[PDB]
Design a protein around this ligand. Structure first.
Ligand SMILES: Nc1ncnc2c1ncn2[C@@H]1O[C@H](COP(=O)(O)OP(=O)(O)OP(=O)(O)O)[C@@H](O)[C@H]1O
Ligand SMILES: Nc1ncnc2c1ncn2[C@@H]1O[C@H](COP(=O)(O)OP(=O)(O)OP(=O)(O)O)[C@@H](O)[C@H]1O
Ligand SMILES: Nc1ncnc2c1ncn2[C@@H]1O[C@H](COP(=O)(O)OP(=O)(O)OP(=O)(O)O)[C@@H](O)[C@H]1O
Ligand SMILES: Nc1ncnc2c1ncn2[C@@H]1O[C@H](COP(=O)(O)OP(=O)(O)OP(=O)(O)O)[C@@H](O)[C@H]1O
Ligand SMILES: Nc1ncnc2c1ncn2[C@@H]1O[C@H](COP(=O)(O)OP(=O)(O)OP(=O)(O)O)[C@@H](O)[C@H]1O
Ligand SMILES: Nc1ncnc2c1ncn2[C@@H]1O[C@H](COP(=O)(O)OP(=O)(O)OP(=O)(O)O)[C@@H](O)[C@H]1O
Ligand code: MOO
Ligand code: MOO
Ligand code: MOO
Ligand SMILES: [Mg+2]
Ligand SMILES: [Mg+2]
Ligand SMILES: [Mg+2]
Lengths: 268, 245, 245, 268, 245, 268
């Protein structure tokens, strides 16, 4: 293995060549924002609930940014489900649904960013970095939309027109590609259960579980989007995520302090 | 059932970046053939990246940059090939169009002119999938995702080789390379060696909604692109797995 | 005297957001009628916001956000209806166009294709007027401001009701609702109850320069939009107060 | 009054419903930038006069931003009057005149921003916030164009094609919608008089007056654009404005320090 | 040898800003002549800055701003003249187009409509050359750079005077001004006095690749622009130094 | 000489008038960023060499920005030479080549900016200032693309289709128009020699030389783009430049500290 061999493989051989892929896997690994944490504020689970849920989380963000660098992504929610229902009934493809979902996540980023504006925290609507380095350095937090930018190029699911990569995947992929140290999904549930706690009478809380163990028990598409679990198994930087209840006061603050609130999902 | 077809009269043509890398000797014949095709089809012409993407991978990997950084760097090279190709067709009313324009205003542009040129790379950017240090969703994958989402009449991939072989027809295993006149996405996905198309193309082909077959033809032979846009078998046909009625 | 007409051959059609909210059962008949109207008129199709704007108002007001914050949040929902409607008409060469494009490049786009789709909300954004916690300059107001500034041939408002009644024909006072075949902006402005159109529409109608009447028709009845674009009386006619020669 | 009743009204009833409007008026009031001050630098009255007027005001802005958060909007001036005259003679509508006026106000924002650039103060040309939260937090001031973004959707006046909402209205509307604490118009006159002091021999200075008192004496369209007075009466956050002479050294500094220089116009 | 011609069928017309400064008395005849020219040519209409650029120079120089700051401030005034001219031609399908659009998508736009309006100032912005406190690359220079890069069929400069004189025909040396029916870029470059065109235009003319002659005609005389676009000698012809076969 | 005479000349006379040009030359001279330094990181000479060359320069930038305001422009390199070769063989004009070269310089700005992002340093891709004042004030450095924005309006050379104004000229013109105090070109050579040191056996290092002396010895197009020398002779703010070897550890740091490493080229 050497730099010269990787160069010659990159020039002579196709990118699909197994030997070229193996040589590229040996390259050095640079983290762009190693000391930052990516947080997703759920759309339907948090922001759609109004001030009773959003105001305490605004307070935790303002308080926690004194000691942590925060990338704050927003979910979509019921307005995106309404758009998905209208467009699916028309037979519109997943690529169009993806564009509609982005606008709802943009809406929630606006509302959250306007409550944080007097604390200096900006919305990363308009550019896609450099707004992020400068703000993380000076103000320690940014707000962005959690929807991936695939738009009409959205990879469709096996069946149906609902985009399989939404705000959970968008926030995680940003955490993985920036080499962040932590990924926290802020929902309206304490964590993962053996069943759906809203529609099940006897479910059991799971403090920690791996992706392989979740698949072996039928929990693939539950509290997290099911492609996020597969992306997690392929990740190099973010090898575990944490799901916490945003409706509990101080849960985001304590999760950022290293407390094992909620459910930790590991890649292996 | 299936979603509707947005642009069912559209023909999508993907030009390989390594075809552009050969300079005027390859570009001028292809340009002249594209001019004669303009009255016959409504064309979305998408360009790949080519050898310059390999150089930015070499520099970027040496800097340790992740796959989410390399993906839009390579995409940029596909856009430069697009500007080059569009400039050669400008006298026929063709221009290069941007990805937001391709996503939202393609219908108006193809109403104004017979063809537009765009980048074949998808706007995955920093949201590219992890797993490999080489970006998986490249020019072939983006061109098919767009054509299938549009419900286009077809997608033709223009390469510097006749099609897909059992081995690299230009590498060390050249003597044992057998030409494949027809194959399927699932057949290729279960093979191991290299391919002239992205392996992510095979994965999006498995979940395809409209495009039934994609032909890989040699753009260095004038006339094969013309024949391919008429359904003539002059290269490798790739069955996607979509059934028609 | 009056200012000149920029696009005197333009027909402007505003599609109510609550009509889009009804899904394919309402959208598909309207789409089929719009396709048949394309050879007959040069159309600027503007979409309203609908029920999703009420949800973002509910969340935003609960967060205490001012009216300058709610206005562009609701405008976004009018744009999503525009993308939905444009996607259904894409095979006919129609696309969604942005507000800067509508302001500066509408003439070229209507030279390339028969119709374009845009948002009916005006770009008032954070500069919305104070006074009410609900944004006053909404889809009806923006559609008329644009049509009158362009000096368009007319503006037709497509609703989920036959027209304007003396009371809400779907609310608690349904039994005492009398249909108004014709009224004026100043007559409606001196009333108190609700209306199917923005009350700010009445204020901009008072200072109108070209548009003499605006008809409110039921888009749930196929054919009425076609008849309205020919000056047939099939809904509520609203006189603006502009005199013609 | 309750959150549930407002929700049901927003879903069932039209937005023009009087009962829906009354319920929305009872909602909470959040100020986005409560501790900021919006200042308008007059185009014809200040910036068109060159360095003799602009340089002392640059010094006051650099000095005052140490203790105040400043949103600095620019007027248009004689170049916009020239554009208005050319376009009005052609019969172009107010919506086109509005676009032409925006470019002149953009010009003045550029020139003012380049004199302040070495102090870290940016021009909010390119985005429309987040550039504002981050800069207000770190550098305490931003420069922006005072023209409203109505463009072709400009609400026309009762007669004529001149846009009735220009840089005075644009700056005030930004102050009202961001919930700022203060609005200062920097002109070339000491304040409001009983007549026009440039063309009247015997006018009397007015230190303080309400909008109703101005209308009752024929001062509606004088030192301020006449629609600004009507917007002021409808405002919820900024219930009074102050007009000061920028050509007097230190007038902007002293106005920011709470001194009653110039004329204070109240909504009621 | 020479580079290829991108748009060899394009006619470029530069409208002087001081012609626009005269108001409707000058603009309306020119607009009516441009309407009748639309069926005859494919037009790129570029507008200059005019007297408002002199005012922003006066303010900017008094503020001490460098030449890189003044260049885009003056360019803005050329864009306002472009919006004004485009608005008058909007009923004929003409709109104002942006500099990125002119650089990359001009072929599609001229396929959709007969003419588009743009700014004649080049996007040199903060990268303007030093040496003078007055920006050298102005409306004439930008219009020729664009026309020669496109390989356009010609460039016609529309002024408020009949052409180039031996002295300013409106200044203190008016009596000794002799009209020049034909001259060359190198002849004018070796003169000292003022000119109705940028002196940087003479420098880019020396390195021109396609445009052989540029005619300066009086736009205040209706018909001369029509005659100039047909190669008739009705003004001052400027030879660039390009030889044809 | 007076402000009134300059105004009357600007209104009555043509801009080509010699007396108008002479009056404008007497105007005051304001520097926008007088305390900043513009640095060009060579594309082919540095960034194309990978981590062995880029990583030490990243360290010097992070270290030197504590005491210096830095505008960091990137070159293009071999990928632009490949694009130039493809397009020249097609007969494409210089204006098209200029657009292709900009993208390669944009690429190098991205890679350099991602290695500096965790230090708060942004890329000025997205806006063209205000991103620069705010970042210079708070983080002391920005990364930008060195290609001029001429695009299709590129002034062509006397012969050939290669753009004569590339990343050397783009960085210098930004330094001159912003009135910066220093301009440093970071290449892969110790400086200027009497010949090309890569292809000459006996060349002699030149510590200091003027533009007139370079032309008199056939060194016009050598280590710097030849139009940069002519722009340097016409400059008002940046009257000399310094060429240093970026491959030598600490050379950029020492050049910023006022050490006469490399070659200083003077306008006169
Ligand atoms: N096993 C499980 N454990 C916990 N929750 C589950 C499980 N299975 C399903 N769920 C449900 O999944 C939901 C998570 O989806 P939800 O829409 O709330 O996330 P979100 O962040 O709001 O997404 P978006 O922002 O895109 O709307 C929870 O409300 C929960 O009721
Ligand atoms: N099984 C195979 N069949 C045919 N060609 C192969 C195979 N494996 C490798 N190749 C090689 O791959 C080359 C094509 O390279 P590649 O597909 O990377 O370029 P491209 O598609 O033009 O570029 P881009 O993907 O950026 O548009 C062929 O010239 C051939 O030598
Ligand atoms: N006087 C009235 N006459 C007729 N309809 C009324 C009246 N008052 C209230 N309405 C109600 O208003 C409804 C129309 O709602 P609305 O105008 O808000 O939706 P829309 O115009 O489709 O949406 P948008 O304004 O976002 O485009 C009608 O269905 C009707 O029930
Ligand atoms: N009663 C009055 N008191 C004081 N000034 C008055 C009165 N009536 C009219 N004016 C005049 O109104 C003018 C204010 O308009 P002016 O154009 O100076 O404001 P501006 O901020 O420059 O606007 P813009 O920036 O849009 O040009 C003053 O110059 C003043 O002479
Ligand atoms: N040698 C000359 N021959 C002819 N006109 C001259 C000469 N020298 C000066 N002029 C003057 O220059 C004037 C034209 O001014 P100018 O070229 O600046 O305006 P413009 O070209 O319309 O504006 P812009 O360059 O912004 O488009 C003529 O009216 C004429 O009086
Ligand atoms: N007299 C000379 N002294 C030193 N170097 C010279 C001389 N003449 C030619 N050169 C060569 O010129 C080259 C400078 O060009 P180079 O492309 O390295 O600059 P760059 O900053 O990489 O430009 P870009 O970023 O546009 O690629 C040096 O590599 C050097 O070998
Ligand atoms: O400006 Mo478009 O959005 O040429 O069709
Ligand atoms: O790009 Mo436009 O500005 O399709 O007409
Ligand atoms: O880029 Mo365009 O949107 O031809 O009208
Ligand atoms: Mg290939
Ligand atoms: Mg309605
Ligand atoms: Mg001239």
């Amino acid at each position: 293995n050497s730099t010269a061999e990787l160069e010659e493989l990159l020039m002579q051989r196709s990118l699909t060549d197994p030997q070229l892929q193996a040589a590229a896997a040996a390259a050095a690994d640079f983290r762009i924002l190693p000391d930052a944490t990516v947080i997703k504020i759920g759309g339907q689970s948090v922001i759609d609930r109004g001030r009773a849920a959003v105001y305490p989380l605004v307070d935790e963000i303002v308080a926690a940014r004194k000691n942590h660098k925060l990338l704050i992504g927003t979910g979509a929610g019921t307005r995106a489900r309404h758009l998905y229902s209208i467009a699916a009934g028309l037979g519109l493809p997943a690529g169009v649904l993806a564009q509609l979902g982005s606008s709802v996540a943009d809406q929630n980023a606006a509302m959250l960013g306007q409550l944080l504006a007097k604390h200096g925290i900006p919305v990363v609507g308009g550019a896609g970095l450099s707004a992020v380095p400068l703000s993380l350095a000076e103000v320690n937090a940014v707000v962005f939309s959690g929807m991936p930018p695939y738009k009409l190029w959205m990879r469709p699911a096996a069946e149906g027109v609902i985009p399989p990569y939404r705000t959970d995947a968008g926030c995680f992929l940003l955490a993985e590609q920036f080499g962040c140290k932590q990924m926290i999904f802020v929902k309206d549930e304490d964590g993962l259960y053996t069943a759906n706690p809203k529609t099940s009478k006897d479910a059991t809380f799971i403090p920690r579980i791996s992706v392989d163990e979740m698949k072996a028990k039928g929990l693939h598409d539950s509290i997290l989007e099911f492609p996020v679990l597969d992306l997690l198994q392929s990740a190099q930087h973010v090898r575990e995520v944490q799901v916490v209840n945003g409706l509990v006061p101080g849960n985001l603050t304590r999760a950022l302090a290293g407390e094992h609130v909620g459910t930790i999902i590991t890649a292996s | 059932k299936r979603p509707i077809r947005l642009l069912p009269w559209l023909q999508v043509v993907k030009i390989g970046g390594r075809v552009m890398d050969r300079g005027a000797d390859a570009i001028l014949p292809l340009v002249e053939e594209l001019r004669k095709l303009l009255p016959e089809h409504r064309l979305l012409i998408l360009t790949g990246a080519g050898v310059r993407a390999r150089h930015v991978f070499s520099v970027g990997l040496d800097l340790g940059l992740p796959v989410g950084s390399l993906a839009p760097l390579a995409a940029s090279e596909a856009g430069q090939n697009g500007h080059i190709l569009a400039a050669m067709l400008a006298s026929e009313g063709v221009s290069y169009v941007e990805h937001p324009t391709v996503a939202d205003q393609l219908a108006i542009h193809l109403s104004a002119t017979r063809a537009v040129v765009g980048s074949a790379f998808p706007p995955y950017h920093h949201h590219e999938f992890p797993g490999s240090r080489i970006p998986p969703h490249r020019a072939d994958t983006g061109a098919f995702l767009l054509a299938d989402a549009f419900g286009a009449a077809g997608l033709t991939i223009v390469e510097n080789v006749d099609g897909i072989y059992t081995a690299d027809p230009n590498g060390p295993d050249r003597g044992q390379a057998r030409f494949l006149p027809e194959t399927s996405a699932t057949d290729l996905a279960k093979s191991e060696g290299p391919l002239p198309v992205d392996r992510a193309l095979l994965d999006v082909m498995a979940t395809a909604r409209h495009i039934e077959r994609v032909q890989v033809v040699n753009g260095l032979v004038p006339g094969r692109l013309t024949a391919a846009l008429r359904g003539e078998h002059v290269g490798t046909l790739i069955r996607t797995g979509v059934r028609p009625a």
